[PDB]
Ligand binder design. Sequence first.
Ligand SMILES: [Zn+2]
Lengths: 141, 120, 159, 347, 131, 242, 60
Amino acid sequence: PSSMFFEHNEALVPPYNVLVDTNFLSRTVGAKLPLLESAMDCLYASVNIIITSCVMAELEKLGPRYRVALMIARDERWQRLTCDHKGTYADDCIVDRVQKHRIYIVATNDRDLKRRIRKIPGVPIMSVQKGKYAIERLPGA
Amino acid sequence: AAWPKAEDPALVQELLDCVQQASHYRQLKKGANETTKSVNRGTSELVILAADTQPLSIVLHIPLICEEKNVPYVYVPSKVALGRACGVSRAVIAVSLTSNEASDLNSKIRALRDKVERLA
Amino acid sequence: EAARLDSELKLVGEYGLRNKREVWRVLLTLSKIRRAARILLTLDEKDPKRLFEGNALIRRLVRIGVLDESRMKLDYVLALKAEDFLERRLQTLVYKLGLAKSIHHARVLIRQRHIRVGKQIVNVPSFMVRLDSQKHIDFALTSPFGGGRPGRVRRKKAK
Amino acid sequence: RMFAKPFLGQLGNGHVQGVYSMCKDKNSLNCIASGSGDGVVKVWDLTTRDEETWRVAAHNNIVKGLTFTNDKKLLSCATDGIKLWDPYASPSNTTPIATWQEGGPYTSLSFHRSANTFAASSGQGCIRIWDLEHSTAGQAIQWPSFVDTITDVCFNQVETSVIGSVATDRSIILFDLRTNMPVIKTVLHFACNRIVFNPMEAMNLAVASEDHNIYIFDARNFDKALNIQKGHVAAVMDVEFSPTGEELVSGSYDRTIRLWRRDAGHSRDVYHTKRMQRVFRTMWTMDSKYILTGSDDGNVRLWRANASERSGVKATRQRQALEYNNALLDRYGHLPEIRRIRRHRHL
Amino acid sequence: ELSVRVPQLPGPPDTLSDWYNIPRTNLTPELKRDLQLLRMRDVVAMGKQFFKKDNRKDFVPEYCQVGTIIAGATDGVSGRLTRKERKRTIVEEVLSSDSVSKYKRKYHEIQEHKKSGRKGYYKKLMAARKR
Amino acid sequence: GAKAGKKVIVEPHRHKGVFVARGGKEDLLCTANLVPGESVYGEKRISVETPTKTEYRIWNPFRSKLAAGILGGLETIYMKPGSKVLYLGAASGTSVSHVADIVGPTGAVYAVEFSHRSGRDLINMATRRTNVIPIVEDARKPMAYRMLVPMVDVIFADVAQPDQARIVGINARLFLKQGGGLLISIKASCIDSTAPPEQVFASEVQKLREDKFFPKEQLTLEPYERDHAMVSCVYLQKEFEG
Amino acid sequence: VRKLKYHEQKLLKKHDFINYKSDNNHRDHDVIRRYMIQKPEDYHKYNRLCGSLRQFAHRL
RNA sequence: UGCCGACAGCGCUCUGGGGAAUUCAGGAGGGGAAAGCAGAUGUGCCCCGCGGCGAGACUGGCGCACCGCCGGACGAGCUG
Ligand SMILES: [Zn+2]
């Protein structure tokens, strides 16, 4: 990937694009935190918090018990990207988007996607830690 | 003939100002032959062309090459004032500036070429 | 954090600094600034505190010329970074104003006190510059580039 | 049942909360308003499936009703009131251009097939009709001693200037507009939820009922139900007659659309997918091929009827084979083998 | 207008239809030599250039034409070969250029280091013995 | 320089029609020119005595971003010899001539340009080369040359405009076969000139996917013209031709 | 026979013109064409004697 | 890119392996093709029913930017 250097992304400068994953969205509602506000504070810059259509599909297909968090996903102020695949596996979705661009900040809390996206370099994890957000591998803040 | 002319209201003045910046900052080729050589080396970031000239055909052929290279140009109305802005002690009808990729002068130039692209 | 490693190294290498102490220090400055930016966004728009404090901070930044005279809003106040703070770091101005061939040669020049800003010669290469002053940087009279004595090597070679 | 592939899409982004109001334009072919639970509405164009035509908030409470005017404008009822915007303005405005606040909570709309008439069903046991450009508070008609609420009302399009409405006495009332008075009131065993009359068979009406049942009635003779559609577990939220007059959407509260002819008495089709918990507004398009499905989960869905017919422009032998299949299945639609592989959906 | 026709009934293709008639390459020894040169072009630019490692087991393409660099209208003062400079074969050109001295010196070097101690050295030891 | 007179060899490249000529200490790229013997712009050329009518033209990368792409080794450049190609941004016609020499007589390329005198050079070459159709108009309003452009298979685009995605999108809406193909090229400094360029490219490709395109290749013509790209997509299918 | 299309193969999964479940993946053909036997009769004679010995082992 | 090539190993394959002729059973691609049976009823007549065009004539009510609207029902001639 151009605009890269020896496992450092010169690319991601503010603002930052951050992908929501399903575990992350469930857990940040479960910890009752404002999405845009907490991200802006933890990163100290401007964001926009996009949701792949696969993720939106996963969080509808989950049971009705997460309907509030599904609404919070459903909010209109945050942009969306379609996908071209078959059958709604969010992790494959996000890793493909990052792999073809390397311009993102993925957010999850599942250890599986954490491993999978450290295994390709230069892309930062964001995750909650019971009080607040936490970045993993971003050189800036 | 010179239809992408720059309008008066201080747009030409920001142009001449950035010309002064780049002339101090050595990112500048001056004179039409230098302009042609810079644009045919592709180092050019932007080029300003006078319209106050004994016949305009020179600053009509130069837009042909910048159209051939897809990099912007703009018509200042005063060859004398452009030469004074560069600091030549001589009138100049064509001045070009290149890119140096670590500054905020490049941000200024990005703004200026956005202006001329909205002019076109 | 190999990304931390390589990123800090590229910072130093693009601007030939000396240690990750100085780089982390400038990052701490940026952190305080973006803290200010976060707070002044936390107050909502058209609030008076927001208006005057944000106008102030933006005037501060454009007074040291780091944030561009073009863009004058809190969005870009968030969007600033270490490359820009290093751009207004001093030694870079000697290199980009064409007195020292290399950033290291500029560092040595600042050591042996040959450039000045306005009146006084400068010894600290991390003396931050101002937008209002940055063109008033030249050699002093006591330095052989600016004149004065020819220097000790010219002295001995004449000897 | 290799090719029984119903789904064809999800437009838009979906409303923030769930769809509790939507309405198709019935005189153009590709324009739909969908209005949210969250007091916002927008309109899509069918052809540009992905993005939006025009979007605005409309009220405070959940928008109960919505439609389009016969010329171009669109209409919104909610409990705050009745409003009228114009979506296809060449610069957009967000402010309405007509309003009403008098008549109580307005439960539903009903619009004229041809002219500029509309009617608003309130919950005060009263309906009231406006004419566009020439009325202010309209004519207030009701059963003259009646308070119990009026959920919905559909203008007939077979015999225009006729009105039917449902009431919460487990009871329906037929109305007229020439003779400005209610006409008749039927009381049934348990409640009814949304009305319709058939767009070909004028005396034939249908009601969608908390009996979990679609009842086909006929206006001249309320002695017996013409048909009983005993097709659900949960209570039906919506009905819409196909413009063919030969088909019917019954959209449950539960996770189930069921599709119907006029003359079965049972389930021809069941549709769902688990992304759609509780369907609300379930109406046909103008080809009678493609239905729309406004969910609880915040979605407008574009589905198909007769779920195995792949449309387009066929070849001659293709339609030969398809209608050959039709005829053969028609002949043998009773035997155990083909019968069970016929009625075996998934549930 | 209508006559008697002629009947004319008496492998891999020879001129590639989808590349504007490139004929099948004739196998001539100087052509083989030029092909070997262009494969081993790495060592030719001894020290100063490096090349993309073109590596097939064969090296002969099925379709190639020897040609001529024609002319530089914008530049012909020094990007033009002189009359003496012009050569028939590319191999004779890279011969007639300079630095073949350095080639020969590297040749004597590699030759010695493969004649390190293999048999001549053993013979001379054997002479130091038998004496 | 690989100076004038050096005997060289030429072989086919991977792509149907383009050729690669290797030699001595420097290789390069050529095309069999349709119009014989004549140079266009002082480009260097190549003659072979075939065992007269056999002439090739060297293709500068730095002048022509399609050549930059052929050096960058694209997946499939979609333009077979004998194919219908709408060019866009056909300024002064050099690259356009190269595409013309690719498609040959049984192909045809429709060369659209905005300004005039670059048009003059273009139409001069259009007199000479019998398979390139001059069109000088405003690209933003393709209904003007709706009289000229039939349905074609391949869309070249090299304009530097903010609405470029929508330009080539309506041109895809008008002049591209079912299962179509296109190459476009993009400059960060003319799409949005403060951002990082990779992010700009993702914005543009997401735009085209909103224009219902299938993104199917990208590269960055890196040692040749900074912070640009060539992007390859397919019109309304996952496979290219049919 | 042509290759089936989608629906054709889907309907006739159990169809096969070549090998049945009564063929054991042509173990007879496999043996004879590795070792050049001339009577597939004789192959099956070997199989019957082998099965007899194997079942004697089973009772053993 | 020359032949020849022992053991010691790896690769495939083994009704041995090639080469050519030739029958057939399949496959995959490219070029060409107006490639078009969305529901198939002789012509001509007038008449009925009903429908459009369509000259011309009206009328109702509205119109605090006042400049115009919107709607009904009669109707010569023509047509399906
Ligand atoms: Zn996806």
